[PDB]
Design a binder for this molecule. Structure first.
Ligand SMILES: *[C@@H]1O[C@H](CO[C@@H]2O[C@@H](C)[C@@H](O)[C@@H](O)[C@@H]2O)[C@@H](O[C@@H]2O[C@H](CO)[C@@H](O[C@@H]3O[C@H](CO)[C@@H](O)[C@H](O[C@H]4O[C@H](CO)[C@@H](O)[C@H](O)[C@@H]4O)[C@@H]3O)[C@H](O)[C@H]2NC(C)=O)[C@H](O)[C@H]1NC(C)=O
Ligand SMILES: *[C@@H]1O[C@H](CO[C@@H]2O[C@@H](C)[C@@H](O)[C@@H](O)[C@@H]2O)[C@@H](O[C@@H]2O[C@H](CO)[C@@H](O[C@@H]3O[C@H](CO)[C@@H](O)[C@H](O)[C@@H]3O)[C@H](O)[C@H]2NC(C)=O)[C@H](O)[C@H]1NC(C)=O
Ligand SMILES: *[C@@H]1O[C@H](CO)[C@@H](O[C@@H]2O[C@H](CO)[C@@H](O[C@@H]3O[C@H](CO)[C@@H](O)[C@H](O)[C@@H]3O)[C@H](O)[C@H]2NC(C)=O)[C@H](O)[C@H]1NC(C)=O
Ligand SMILES: *[C@@H]1O[C@H](CO)[C@@H](O[C@@H]2O[C@H](CO)[C@@H](O[C@@H]3O[C@H](CO)[C@@H](O)[C@H](O)[C@@H]3O)[C@H](O)[C@H]2NC(C)=O)[C@H](O)[C@H]1NC(C)=O
Ligand SMILES: *[C@@H]1O[C@H](CO)[C@@H](O[C@@H]2O[C@H](CO)[C@@H](O)[C@H](O)[C@H]2NC(C)=O)[C@H](O)[C@H]1NC(C)=O
Ligand SMILES: *[C@@H]1O[C@H](CO)[C@@H](O[C@@H]2O[C@H](CO)[C@@H](O)[C@H](O)[C@H]2NC(C)=O)[C@H](O)[C@H]1NC(C)=O
Ligand SMILES: CCCCCCCCCCCCCCCC(=O)O
Ligand SMILES: *[C@@H]1O[C@H](CO)[C@@H](O)[C@H](O)[C@H]1NC(C)=O
Lengths: 235, 116, 68, 283, 267, 92, 102
C-alpha cells in the first residue's frame, strides 16, 4: 500500500473540523429549493437591523414592556442625564439582549461602528432639543451635559422627522474588542441630555416617551465563534 | 478540593446596607489560581458585580455595590460584597462564583432575606 | 478533476519565493458522487441589506426629507 | 461577486460641511434603518479597511458539531430480572438548547446534515469481573419502518434501514445525510395544525397539537450493544453531534430570550425576566 | 415641485381605494413584492384558480379600541380573512392556496395625544400556550380567532383546570407571545404608528413559506402583532380611548385542488 | 362603669346591748364614687343607725328591731344601690 | 427582609352588646409581613389585615382584638405578640384594657 504516517489529530473528533464523510442515504431524491423571500447570507445582516433597547431595567420595569420606554417631561432645563449606558454591546444589560447583542454573544470579538437611533413618541404639539453623546473611554464618565458635549454628539431637534441617529464611530485601541466587560477593550459612554427642554402648549401631555434603537454599520464584524451564556439546560 | 463558603441565608435590613459573605476555602495542600469573582442576581442574563485579579472591579450600578475585601493584585479569596440601601426589590437568591484554575468555577447560592 | 483556489493570506511569513506573496493557492478534489458529502467551500456571497433596512416602496434618498 | 472573506469598505476622508443635505435626520416610522457611515456625521480620515465578515457567513456561524442528545444503553448479565436496555431517540435538535437557539435566528433553513457519534462506557457494579470490547449498532428507523421492541429482535437485520456498526475505542462514528425535508426548506416554526377540526365531527377526532406537523418527523435512531450478555454489567452512552453543512437560511427572527419550554415556543412562569436592573443615568 | 410626498399616499386594489395624508412611507417586507407562482417553482399540476379583483381588494376587519390598559392585539393570515367575500370562498373550496397581502393599520388621534404602536408582520408567528402541564395544546378553534383577532397579556396565567383545559394561547407582551424579547421584534418587517408623526402603518407582504403553496385552512403564513411601545395618553385625561382599524387586501392569490367546500369546526 | 355595691359587716348574731358594730358600704366603680347615701327600706334611718360617710355605725339597741338597709352610691356615671336586712335579738 | 416596628393601643369601649375592637396592634413596614398573635387570660377574636407598606415589598399588618366588652375586663391585660424573622425575639406589646361602665 502507499506508505503513510498518521499525524496528531487522527481519529478525533474536533467539532470544528471540515471533512468528508459517507452518505447514509445514497441517491436520495432531494427536494429542490424554491425562491423563498428573506434569504440571509451573513449574521451581520441581522445586526444591521434596528432593534429596540430595554433602557430602563429598574426593579419594577425590567422584564415588562415599560423597560423599553424612556420617560421625558416638560420640566425646566437641567444638565443632568436622561440616560447613561456603557458601550459594551454584548455585556451591558441594556444592549446584550438586543439582536446585535444576542449575535455578539456567539462571538468572542467585535469591531466596527454602531448607531443609536431615537424615536420621539410625544404629541405633535410637543417640541424640544436633546443632546445625544458618545464619549470614548479613559476619562470620568459624563454625568453633566458640560462633559458629554465635549465628546462625539448629535443635537437633536424634535420635529416632523420623528427620529434622530447618532453614529458611534469605531474608536478603539485594539483591532477588535472582547464581547465581555473588560477594561482593556472598554468602549466608552453613551448618554442623552436635555439641550433646551421639552415644551408643550396647554391641553397636551407633559410627559412622554422616547424609544431607542441600536444597529451595526456596514463596517461591523465579529469573529471567534463561541457558545452563548444566554441559554442553558439544567440537568 | 477547592470549595466555596457562604451562608445559606443573609438578613437583610430595609433601607440599611448588608454584607453578603462569600469566601473560598482552599485546602493548603493543593494550589489554585482564582482569576475573578462574580456576583449575580438569580437569572439576570448576566452579572451584577464582578471583581478581577488585575482588572479590578465592575458594577451594574456602581453607587450601590462594593466588594468588601477583594483587593487588586492580591490572591482572591474573599468575595464578600456589601450592598447599600436595601429595598424590597432587593430580596432574592444571589449566586456568588469564583473563577479558579485548574479546578474550574465554583459557586454557591445566597438567599438575601430582607426584613424590617 | 482538481479545484484550485486562492487563500486570503492574513499573517505572511518572511517569504516571497515560496510563501507569503506569490498568491497562495489550495487544492480540493471531491471524492464522492453525492454533493452532500462535500466540504463547505466558504466562497460565499454578500448582498445589500435593503430588503430589510429599506423595504419602502418609494426609494430612500438619505440627503432628502424622508417625509415629503 | 462580493465574497464572505472580502475586506469591508474603506473609510473615506471627509471634511467640514454646511448645507441642506441632512443624513442625520430620518424617520424610523417608514420601517427603514438609516444607512449612515461616520463620514455622514463627523470628519473622517482615509482608512484602508482590511477587516472582513468571513467568520459570520451563515456557513461559518453554523460550522460546528453541537450535542443534540445522549442515548443510554447497556449490556447486563443474562440472569437479570431487567431487560437489556437498547435506546430509541426521536431525531430532533430540540432536546438541547444551544444549536436550537442558533437555528431559531431563522424561520426556514436548508442543509446537509453531518452526524458524529461519541461513545463512552463504564462498569457499574463494584465487582472485579471484566468485559470484552463492545460493538454498537446505530440503526436509523425512518417513519413507517418497524421500531425494535427487543435488543435482539428481527428489525436489527437492517436490510434496508441504514445502520452504523461502531467499534468501541475507535474514532467517533460519522455519516452525512442530504437535505431530506418533505418541503423545499425545513420549517423552524409552523404556525398551524396538522388537522382541520370539522363541524360535523367530534372535537376529539379533529384535534391536534398547535405548531406540530410531519414537516419535522424524521424517525428515530435505535441503538444497541451487539455483544451478548456479559456477567459484569456495562453501561454506555452515545452522544450525538449535529453539524448543519452547506446551509441556507431565510427570514430572520429575534433570538429566544427566556428559557425553552418544550418543543414549541411556550414559556414557563418564573422564567420571564431576562433583563437585570440598571439605572437610566448610570454608565 | 408638484408636492408629492411620503406622507400622502393612495392605494387602489380591485374596486377599493385607501388614502392617507399622514403616512411614514410604506414597507415591502424583505424587499419582495407579491407574485404569482412561477412555473419553475410550481408543484400541484392542475390549472390554478386566480380570483384577481374578486379577492384582491381591501377588506376591513372589526375595529378595536386602544386605551391606557391595552396590552396589544394579534391576528393571523389567511385566518383573519377567512370569512371575507370571495377570498374566503375560494380559500375554503380549495385544498391549496397562496397569497400575499397589503396590510394597512389605521389609527388617528390629535396633536395633543401621544402614544406609539409597533406593527409587526411575523412569518410563522407561533404563539405560546396557556398550559404548564401539556405543550402545543392550543386548539384549532382558539388558535384561529378569525377577524376579531386575539390579545396579548402582561401576565402569564397557567390554566390549572386539567378536567377541561381551556386550550388557548397565553401570549405575554414583552415576550412577543412566543418566548423572545419584544425589543427585538424590529428584525421582522414593521412600522411604528407614533401619533405625533403618522396615523397609519402599511406593510406589503409577499407569500412566505417553505413550500410554493400549502393548506390555508391548516396553516397561517403570517401573523400581525400590534403592541403599544409607548402607552396612549391625552391632555390630562385618565381614560382616553382611540380606535384602531385594520384593512387588508390579498394580493396575487391563487388556489389549487378544487373540491366541495371545507366546513371547519370553529367553536 | 357605674357603682357595683354591696354591704359587709353583718354576722347574723347581733344581739341587744352589744357594742358599736359598724358596716361598710363596699363599692367598686370607675371613676371613684363621688357620693354615698345611707337610707332604710322605710325611708329615714332609724335613730340607732348613724351614717358615717361610706359606713353605718350600729349602736346598741334597747329593744329588737328590723330594718332593711339601702346604700345609694353616686359616682360620676350613675347611682346604684344595695340591700341588707339586719336583725337584732336577745338569744343567749 | 425589612425589620418592622410596631404599636399597640387600647381602644376604649363602652358597654355595647356587640363584639367590638378593644385593642389594636400594628406592625408597620414588615418584610416579610409580621405575624401578630394575641395572648391573654381572656381570649377573644382577632381580626387581622394588611396594607402595602412604605418601601416596595414591605407590608404593614394591623390586627385588632375584638371582644364583647364587659366590666370585669376593664384594667385587665392583653398582650400582642409581633413575631418576625428579623427580631432578636418575638417582641411583646401589652395593652391595658379599658371599659367604661355603671
Ligand atoms: C432563595 O433560594 C431558596 C432555596 O431553594 C432553592 O432556590 C430557589 C430560588 C428555587 O429555585 C428552589 O426550587 C431551589 O431549591 C428559595 O426558597 C425555596 O423556594 C422553594 C420554591 O419556591 C420552596 O418550595 C416550597 O417548599 C415548601 C417546604 O419547604 C413546600 O411546602 C412548598 O410546597 C408548596 O408549593 C409547591 C410548589 O413549590 C407545591 O408543589 C405544593 O403543592 C405546595 O403548594 C414548596 O414546595 C422552598 O420552601 C424553599 N427552599 C428552601 C430550602 O428554603 C427562595 O425562594 C429563594 N429566595 C427568594 C427570596 O425567593
Ligand atoms: C323582725 O322581723 C321578724 C320577722 O322577720 C321575717 O323576715 C322579714 C323580711 C319579714 O318578711 C317578716 O315579716 C318575717 O317574719 C319578726 O319576727 C317574725 O314575726 C312573725 C309574726 O309577726 C313570725 O311569723 C311566724 O311565721 C312562722 C313561719 O315562718 C310560724 O311558724 C309562726 O307561727 C309565726 O306565724 C316570724 O316567724 C318571726 N320571725 C322569726 C325569726 O321568728 C320580729 O318581730 C321583727 N322584730 C321585732 C322584734 O319587732
Ligand atoms: C472576608 O472579609 C470580610 C470583609 O473584610 C470579613 O468580614 C468582616 O471583617 C471585619 C473585620 O475583620 C469583622 O469585624 C470586626 O468585627 C467586629 C464585630 O465582630 C466589627 O465591629 C469590626 O469591624 C471588627 O474589625 C466582621 O465581623 C466581618 N464581618 C462578617 C460578616 O464576617 C470576613 O470576616 C472575611 N471572611 C472570611 C471567611 O475570612
Ligand atoms: C391598668 O392600668 C390602670 C391605670 O391606668 C391600673 O389602675 C391603677 O391600679 C392601681 C392598683 O392596681 C391603683 O393604684 C393604687 O392607687 C392608690 C391611690 O388611689 C395607692 O394608694 C396605691 O399604692 C396603689 O398605687 C391606681 O389608683 C390605678 N390607677 C388609676 C389612674 O386609677 C391597673 O392596675 C392596670 N391593670 C393591669 C392589669 O395592668
Ligand atoms: C375581619 O374584620 C373585617 C373588618 O371589620 C371584616 O371585613 C368586613 O367583612 C364583612 C363580611 O364579609 C363585610 O360585610 C364588611 O363590609 C367588612 N368590613 C369592613 C370594615 O371592611 C371581616 O368580615 C373579618 N374577617 C374574618 C375572616 O372574620
Ligand atoms: C400588665 O401589664 C403591665 C404592663 O403594661 C405589666 O407591667 C410590667 O410589670 C413588670 C413586673 O411585673 C415590670 O418589670 C415592667 O416594668 C412593667 N411594665 C411597665 C410598662 O411598667 C404587668 O406585669 C401586667 N400585669 C398583669 C396582671 O397582667
Ligand atoms: C445511521 C444514521 C442515520 C441518520 C439519519 C438522519 C435522518 C434525517 C434527520 C433530519 C434532521 C432535521 C433537522 C431539522 C429539523 C426541523 O425541521 O426542525
Ligand atoms: C340616689 O341618689 C341620687 C343623688 O341625690 C338621687 O338623685 C337618686 O334618685 C337616688 N336613687 C334612689 C333610688 O334612691
Amino acid at each position: 500500500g502507499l506508505p503513510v504516517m498518521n499525524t496528531p489529530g487522527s481519529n478525533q473528533y474536533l467539532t470544528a473540523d471540515n471533512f468528508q464523510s459517507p452518505c447514509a442515504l445514497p441517491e436520495f431524491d432531494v427536494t429542490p429549493p424554491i425562491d423563498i423571500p428573506g434569504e440571509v447570507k451573513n449574521m451581520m445582516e441581522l445586526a444591521e437591523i434596528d432593534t429596540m433597547i430595554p433602557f430602563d431595567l429598574s426593579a419594577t420595569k425590567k422584564n415588562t414592556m415599560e423597560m423599553y420606554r424612556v420617560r421625558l417631561s416638560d420640566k425646566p432645563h437641567t444638565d443632568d442625564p436622561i440616560l447613561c449606558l456603557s458601550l459594551s454591546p454584548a455585556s451591558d444589560p441594556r444592549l446584550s439582549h438586543t439582536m446585535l447583542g444576542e449575535i455578539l454573544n456567539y462571538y468572542t470579538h467585535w469591531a466596527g461602528s454602531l448607531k443609536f437611533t431615537f424615536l420621539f413618541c410625544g404629541s405633535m404639539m410637543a417640541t424640544g432639543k436633546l443632546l445625544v453623546s458618545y464619549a470614548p473611554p479613559g476619562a470620568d464618565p459624563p454625568k453633566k451635559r458640560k462633559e458629554a458635549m465635549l465628546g462625539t454628539h448629535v443635537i437633536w431637534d424634535i420635529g416632523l422627522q420623528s427620529s434622530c441617529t447618532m453614529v458611534v464611530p469605531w474608536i478603539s485601541n485594539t483591532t477588535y474588542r472582547q464581547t465581555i466587560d473588560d477594561s482593556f477593550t472598554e468602549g466608552g459612554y453613551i448618554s442623552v441630555f436635555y439641550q433646551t427642554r421639552i415644551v408643550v402648549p396647554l391641553s397636551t401631555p407633559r410627559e412622554m416617551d422616547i424609544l431607542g434603537f441600536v444597529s451595526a454599520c456596514n463596517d461591523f464584524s465579529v469573529r471567534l465563534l463561541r457558545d452563548t451564556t444566554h441559554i442553558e439546560q439544567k440537568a | 478540593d477547592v470549595v466555596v463558603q457562604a451562608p445559606t441565608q443573609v438578613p437583610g435590613f430595609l433601607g440599611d446596607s448588608v454584607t453578603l459573605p462569600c469566601y473560598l476555602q482552599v485546602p493548603n495542600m493543593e494550589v489554585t489560581h482564582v482569576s475573578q469573582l462574580t456576583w449575580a442576581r438569580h437569572g439576570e442574563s448576566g452579572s451584577m458585580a464582578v471583581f478581577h485579579q488585575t482588572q479590578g472591579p465592575s458594577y451594574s450600578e456602581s453607587k450601590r455595590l462594593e466588594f468588601v475585601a477583594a483587593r487588586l493584585g492580591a490572591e482572591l479569596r474573599n468575595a464578600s460584597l456589601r450592598m447599600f440601601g436595601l429595598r424590597v426589590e432587593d430580596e432574592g437568591n444571589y449566586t456568588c462564583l469564583f473563577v479558579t484554575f485548574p479546578q474550574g468555577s465554583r459557586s454557591v447560592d445566597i438567599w438575601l432575606r430582607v426584613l424590617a | 478533476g482538481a479545484q484550485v483556489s486562492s487563500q486570503k493570506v492574513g499573517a505572511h511569513e518572511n517569504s516571497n519565493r515560496a510563501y507569503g506573496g506569490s498568491t497562495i493557492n489550495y487544492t480540493t478534489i471531491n471524492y464522492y458522487r453525492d454533493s452532500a458529502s462535500n466540504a463547505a467551500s466558504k466562497q460565499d456571497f454578500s448582498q445589500d441589506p435593503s430588503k430589510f433596512t429599506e423595504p419602502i416602496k418609494d426609494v430612500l434618498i438619505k440627503t432628502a426629507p424622508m417625509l415629503n | 461577486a462580493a465574497t464572505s472573506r472580502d475586506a469591508l469598505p474603506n473609510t473615506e476622508a471627509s471634511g467640514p460641511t454646511h448645507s441642506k443635505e441632512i443624513p442625520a435626520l430620518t424617520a424610523v416610522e417608514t420601517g427603514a434603518t438609516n444607512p449612515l457611515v461616520p463620514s455622514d456625521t463627523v470628519q473622517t480620515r482615509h482608512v484602508v479597511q482590511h477587516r472582513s465578515r468571513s467568520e459570520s457567513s451563515i456557513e461559518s456561524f453554523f460550522a460546528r458539531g453541537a450535542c443534540v442528545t445522549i442515548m443510554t444503553v447497556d449490556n447486563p448479565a443474562s440472569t437479570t430480572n431487567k431487560d437489556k436496555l437498547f435506546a430509541v431517540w426521536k431525531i430532533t435538535y430540540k432536546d438541547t438548547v444551544q444549536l436550537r437557539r442558533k437555528l431559531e435566528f431563522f424561520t426556514y433553513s436548508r442543509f446537509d446534515m453531518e452526524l458524529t457519534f461519541v461513545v463512552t462506557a463504564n462498569f457499574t457494579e463494584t465487582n472485579n469481573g471484566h468485559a470484552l470490547n463492545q460493538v454498537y449498532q446505530i440503526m436509523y428507523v425512518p417513519p413507517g419502518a418497524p421500531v425494535p421492541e427487543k435488543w435482539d429482535d428481527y428489525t436489527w437485520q437492517t436490510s434496508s434501514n441504514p445502520s452504523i456498526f461502531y467499534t468501541y475505542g475507535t474514532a467517533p462514528a460519522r455519516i452525512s445525510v442530504p437535505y431530506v425535508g418533505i418541503s423545499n426548506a425545513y420549517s423552524h416554526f409552523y404556525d398551524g395544525f396538522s388537522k382541520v377540526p370539522l363541524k360535523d365531527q367530534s372535537a376529539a377526532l379533529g384535534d391536534s397539537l398547535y405548531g406540530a406537523a410531519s414537516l419535522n418527523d424524521f424517525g428515530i435512531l435505535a441503538v444497541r450493544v451487539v455483544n451478548d450478555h456479559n456477567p459484569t454489567k456495562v453501561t454506555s452512552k452515545i452522544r450525538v453531534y449535529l453539524k448543519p453543512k452547506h446551509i441556507r437560511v431565510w427570514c430572520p427572527r429575534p433570538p429566544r430570550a427566556v428559557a425553552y419550554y418544550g418543543p414549541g415556543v411556550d414559556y414557563k412562569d418564573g422564567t420571564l425576566t431576562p433583563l437585570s436592573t440598571k439605572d437610566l443615568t448610570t454608565y | 415641485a408638484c408636492g408629492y410626498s411620503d406622507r400622502v399616499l393612495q392605494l387602489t386594489l380591485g374596486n377599493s381605494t385607501i388614502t392617507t395624508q399622514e403616512a411614514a412611507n410604506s414597507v415591502v417586507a424583505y424587499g419582495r413584492w407579491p407574485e404569482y407562482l412561477r412555473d419553475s417553482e410550481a408543484n400541484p399540476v392542475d390549472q390554478p384558480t386566480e380570483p384577481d379583483v374578486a379577492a384582491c381588494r381591501f377588506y376591513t376587519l372589526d375595529t378595536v379600541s386602544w386605551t391606557k390598559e391595552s396590552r396589544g392585539w394579534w391576528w393571523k393570515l389567511p385566518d383573519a380573512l377567512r370569512d371575507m367575500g370571495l377570498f374566503g370562498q375560494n380559500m375554503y373550496y380549495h385544498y391549496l392556496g397562496r397569497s400575499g397581502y397589503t396590510v394597512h393599520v389605521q389609527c388617528n388621534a390629535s396633536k395633543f395625544h401621544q402614544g406609539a404602536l409597533g406593527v409587526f408582520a411575523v412569518p410563522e408567528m407561533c404563539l405560546a400556550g396557556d398550559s404548564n402541564t401539556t405543550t402545543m395544546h392550543t386548539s384549532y378553534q382558539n388558535a384561529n380567532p378569525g377577524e376579531k383577532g386575539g390579545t396579548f397579556t402582561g401576565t402569564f396565567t397557567p390554566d390549572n383546570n386539567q378536567t377541561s383545559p381551556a386550550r388557548r394561547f397565553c401570549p405575554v407582551d414583552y415576550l412577543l407571545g412566543n418566548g423572545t424579547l419584544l425589543g427585538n421584534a424590529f428584525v421582522f418587517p414593521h412600522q411604528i404608528i407614533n401619533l405625533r408623526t403618522n396615523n397609519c402603518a402599511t406593510l406589503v407582504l409577499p407569500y412566505v413559506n417553505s413550500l410554493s403553496i400549502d393548506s390555508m385552512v391548516k396553516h397561517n403564513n403570517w401573523g400581525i402583532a400590534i403592541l403599544p411601545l409607548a402607552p396612549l395618553n391625552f391632555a390630562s385625561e385618565s381614560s382616553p380611548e382611540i380606535p384602531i382599524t385594520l384593512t387588508i387586501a390579498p394580493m396575487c392569490c391563487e388556489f389549487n385542488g378544487l373540491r366541495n367546500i371545507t366546513l371547519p369546526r370553529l367553536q | 362603669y357605674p357603682p357595683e355595691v354591696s354591704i359587709s359587716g353583718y354576722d347574723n348574731n347581733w344581739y341587744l346591748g352589744q357594742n358599736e358594730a359598724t358596716l361598710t358600704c363596699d363599692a367598686r366603680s370607675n371613676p371613684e364614687p363621688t357620693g354615698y347615701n345611707w337610707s332604710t327600706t322605710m325611708g329615714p334611718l332609724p335613730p340607732f343607725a348613724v351614717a358615717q360617710g361610706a359606713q353605718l355605725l350600729i349602736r346598741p339597741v334597747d329593744k329588737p328591731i328590723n330594718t332593711t338597709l339601702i346604700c345609694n352610691v353616686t359616682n360620676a356615671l350613675g347611682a346604684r344601690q344595695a340591700e341588707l336586712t339586719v336583725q337584732v335579738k336577745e338569744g343567749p | 427582609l425589612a425589620k418592622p416596628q410596631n404599636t399597640a393601643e387600647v381602644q376604649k369601649v363602652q358597654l355595647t352588646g356587640e363584639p367590638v375592637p378593644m385593642a389594636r396592634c400594628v406592625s408597620t413596614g414588615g418584610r416579610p409581613p409580621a405575624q401578630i398573635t394575641w395572648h391573654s387570660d381572656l381570649g377573644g377574636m382577632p381580626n387581622t389585615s394588611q396594607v402595602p407598606g412604605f418601601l416596595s415589598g414591605t407590608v404593614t399588618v394591623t390586627s385588632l382584638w375584638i371582644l364583647v366588652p364587659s366590666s370585669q375586663v376593664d384594667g385587665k391585660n392583653v398582650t400582642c405578640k409581633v413575631e418576625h424573622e428579623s427580631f432578636e425575639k418575638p417582641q411583646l406589646l401589652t395593652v391595658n384594657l379599658t371599659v367604661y361602665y355603671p
